[PDB]
Amino acid sequence: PAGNTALCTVGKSGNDLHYRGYDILDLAEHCEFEEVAHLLIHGKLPTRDELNAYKSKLKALRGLPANVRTVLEALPAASHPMDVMRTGVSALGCTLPEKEGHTVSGARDIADKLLASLSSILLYWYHYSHNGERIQPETDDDSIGGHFLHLLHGEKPTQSWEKAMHISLVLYAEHEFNASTFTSRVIAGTGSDVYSAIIGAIGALRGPKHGGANEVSLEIQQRYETPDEAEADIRKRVENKEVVIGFGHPVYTIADPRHQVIKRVAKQLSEEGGSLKMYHIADRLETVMWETKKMFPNLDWFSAVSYNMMGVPTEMFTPLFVIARVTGWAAHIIEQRQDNKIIRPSANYTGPEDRPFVSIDDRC
Amino acid sequence: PAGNTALCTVGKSGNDLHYRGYDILDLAEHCEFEEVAHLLIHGKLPTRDELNAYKSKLKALRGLPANVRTVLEALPAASHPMDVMRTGVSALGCTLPEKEGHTVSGARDIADKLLASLSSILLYWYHYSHNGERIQPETDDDSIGGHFLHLLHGEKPTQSWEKAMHISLVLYAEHEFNASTFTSRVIAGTGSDVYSAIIGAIGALRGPKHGGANEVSLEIQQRYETPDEAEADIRKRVENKEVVIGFGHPVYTIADPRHQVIKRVAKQLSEEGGSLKMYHIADRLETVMWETKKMFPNLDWFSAVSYNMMGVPTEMFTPLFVIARVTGWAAHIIEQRQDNKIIRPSANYTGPEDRPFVSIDDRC
């Protein structure tokens, strides 16, 4: 145990997930993502009136500073979209810096600014560099996911795509201690600013062993023409001691509770389109992965199908992880500041013993 | 048992520091910083021929890409200088990205580029934002330290200042696990890129509890006009249970071996310039902290004086710590990728026990 938290419980029964006491099943079923972002950042499920004010507040924070636009326009088309988000946030930190007091209130305002504008940072860079257009970040869209989709596709998404986006983001919002969250906490713990703690987190989430997962879940799912030929190739790959990504989890011993939710979303999204190809392939390999290895699918297995049905480019999967997870990060950064206990990390040495100094001419 | 390292031992005897088995006392007396950089990044103390080539390589790596310049130009004059580095390194990662393989050789290329240009990033921004000038970063100075001072002051430094920079930067080059180093290894343990690992480390080092203890050390020393007065106020604060920054260490139980070395450096700088007011106060307060609390001074006590004598603005203290410590971080990044073992932290839970969901219109 690396620290204390009041934020999140996962895997006590082998298959449960809670955000500040609330079940993720209930949260995914009923809440807009914004309700969950309010729970994490601002501490509680908002009333109706608290939600209205919060959604209006977020709606007005979607803009990009003139100088940030100049920063984004300078980043080449081939940039890792994660590095684009990292740079934009970094530039923003220089432009709207935290007040040197580091108030809880100030931390939340930054959280809320990042949350509203990360989509704008990504997609403004994307459309300028890829298409030569300076898009309008300040849409009339009423939700974060809906804003995302609008800015990506150049049109307002269906009510259907918006609701599924709410469910996606909620499932990804918080997950106790992991590499990115822990990083944010280590950075918060030195007395550093919110932006920096969020920027280290983003760098950790960029790593394919952490935030990359579903990018390759989609890569596996798209290899195969049919559910039969997927089955054959995977059990061939498992017999050759390959790790199939999208399966298993450190903490969970029985199931990832977010999976059943995202599978259901993927199913509806695939149906509504009229194409259940990719879904049936994922569903087959799920059965096959259990027969072969006794592994359950994690959230990153079917999120691949749901996102792709919504036309999300592969290289934007992790950036969406950042739009969702920034809410947990912001909660953890704030919690770390309040009980700023630190666990001094120390190592085990395996280098050479003390040895005499060799002079420069003496080492040739 | 957070991880294994072959890089550095700290306080095995209580007052000892080794970089790859070499004693810090020997390194600081005999090595150009470039030689310690080479030891941490490339693995060995270089032969004369290898140093000649390394310096020729670093001298030509001082440049700033056209797009990166444009990025730095958008950062307002009032940016934290650490946030400027953060942004600059961020944009550079988009510009000269690591190839997807993450080979050892490519990592060292990025560490070397970063080692050579961190000073260019910082000071191009400073002199554009503060003085309206586009400086030439590709100078003819023959050391990183000397390059820094040239771009800061607008003139080549004295030989003496150059050598003092060599020493300072050797002293700050590496220090086993700590917040910034551990952050670099967490980010690296996700399979993320060198820039991301370094950018998070910068974020951690920016916290006043970690990166800028010598800035507050300077504030302390500069409160007072005389040793006698300094002694009266600090011993009054100590009686009132105040913490005096620049004293103690979590690892060293006897002495910081880096202190003796920087004290000598600061003595020569203060004497060559003329003023000893600050030195005589720092040196006096050292005595007071010993008699009163049996606390020894750590490196951040006299490095204030020495950097001050070299005309370094206080806000550039921690940026200079980055120039030095990027060598350790880079070596630590390389190590985590080799002997890889996850991130994996866990928490104990203190939040609300499973509670019922209240639907939005029924909350109060």
Side-chain angles (χ1 to χ4, degrees), chain B residues 226-228 230 267 270-271 275-276 278-286 302 305:
Chain B
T226 183
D228 263 3
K267 207 208 170 170
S270 300
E271 289 269 9
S275 52
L276 284 147
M278 232 172 144
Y279 179 98
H280 285 134
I281 288 153
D283 187 21
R284 174 69 154 264
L285 287 187
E286 168 177 358
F302 275 100
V305 176

Side-chain angles (χ1 to χ4, degrees), chain A residues 113-162 164-208 210-218 220-228 230-235 237 240-243 245-248:
Chain A
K113 172 69 201 189
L114 260 16
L115 176 62
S117 65
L118 282 151
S119 277
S120 303
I121 293 166
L122 208 226
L123 269 353
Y124 182 89
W125 156 74
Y126 179 82
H127 282 290
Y128 179 82
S129 61
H130 286 63
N131 296 317
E133 181 188 5
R134 296 178 168 88
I135 63 172
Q136 167 64 277
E138 286 148 291
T139 65
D140 194 52
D141 297 291
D142 280 318
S143 89
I144 291 162
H147 171 77
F148 178 82
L149 289 186
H150 188 169
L151 285 196
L152 166 69
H153 292 303
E155 71 183 5
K156 195 187 181 198
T158 48
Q159 190 60 210
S160 192
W161 283 14
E162 190 160 354
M165 278 296 308
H166 278 298
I167 292 151
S168 294
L169 300 174
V170 162
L171 296 175
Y172 270 99
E174 166 55 17
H175 220 230
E176 203 229 45
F177 286 9
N178 54 53
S180 52
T181 285
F182 183 71
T183 290
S184 84
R185 282 191 80 120
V186 166
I187 298 174
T190 73
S192 193
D193 72 295
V194 172
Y195 296 95
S196 295
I198 291 177
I199 285 154
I202 292 173
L205 201 69
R206 183 214 206 260
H210 187 39
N214 69 159
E215 299 214 356
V216 31
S217 287
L218 167 138
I220 301 155
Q221 284 161 192
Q222 286 192 141
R223 285 184 206 155
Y224 316 115
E225 343 71 11
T226 206
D228 269 327
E231 171 155 13
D233 192 59
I234 242 48
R235 63 206 305 148
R237 286 174 170 275
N240 170 224
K241 302 209 175 71
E242 279 176 58
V243 165
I245 296 146
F247 287 86

Side-chain angles (χ1 to χ4, degrees), chain B residues 192-206:
Chain B
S192 197
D193 75 305
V194 181
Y195 297 97
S196 292
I198 283 174
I199 285 157
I202 294 172
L205 197 71
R206 181 222 208 266

